[PDB]
Design a protein around this ligand. Structure first.
Ligand code: CA
Ligand code: CA
Ligand code: CA
Ligand code: CA
Ligand code: CA
Ligand code: CA
Ligand code: CA
Lengths: 121, 116
């Protein structure tokens, strides 16, 4: 029997790495996140998601004893809305997404996801 | 993006439910069943097709499901406890269409797959 939570964090990590780190065209967009710790608190879920950005991959953890550079709090249904910085600004303004710490981290993350969709690799 | 998401969900479900040979008789209750999962707020459906070897997940399905479940994402981790599924249906947190036995068997299997 494999516990559920580590399987979920491993799955998210695999998805993020294939989507964001596989293409070398995105290197300059990923550089903006190097060394950043982004904590994601999904409302209604009892656990946190912590994304640690390095040069060759992002690591996803279910716990983090240290400091996060940016912390985002939102319901899961906000994720398909994070299409670009415009939508991100509207979500912050409406209170659908709450940001603590460095707002630039989540702006750079959303910008990277936007470019990852643009880039056909 | 959709085939990457479904492949990830398929891998998660198979490692969680299909890895242990001890669960074979519990999985047999779902053989040939199709379970559609509509996560509220998301534009796409998740379709789970149960076979003896594995569960297959698809993002698109030209067909009917034996059972369809509709809920917000936060209700999804509450689906590994068979005794609370009735409470979720009663509270309206989980809406069920079609054959209720399919989701009951799925939750019973998910409960047996995990130490509390
Ligand atoms: Ca890792
Ligand atoms: Ca501190
Ligand atoms: Ca830091
Ligand atoms: Ca976009
Ligand atoms: Ca791409
Ligand atoms: Ca049966
Ligand atoms: Ca259990």
């Amino acid at each position: 029997e494999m516990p559920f939570k580590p399987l979920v964090t491993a799955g998210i990590e695999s998805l993020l790495n294939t989507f964001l780190y596989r293409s070398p065209a995105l290197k300059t967009a990923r550089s903006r996140l190097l060394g950043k710790v982004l904590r994601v608190e999904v409302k209604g879920f009892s656990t946190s998601l912590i994304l640690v950005f390095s040069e060759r991959q992002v690591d996803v953890l279910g716990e983090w004893a240290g400091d996060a550079d940016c912390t985002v709090i939102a319901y899961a249904s906000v994720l398909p809305k994070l299409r670009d910085r415009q939508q991100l600004t509207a979500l912050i303004r409406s209170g659908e997404l709450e940001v603590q710490g460095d707002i630039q981290v989540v702006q750079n993350f959303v910008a990277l996801a936007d470019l990852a969709e643009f880039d056909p690799a």
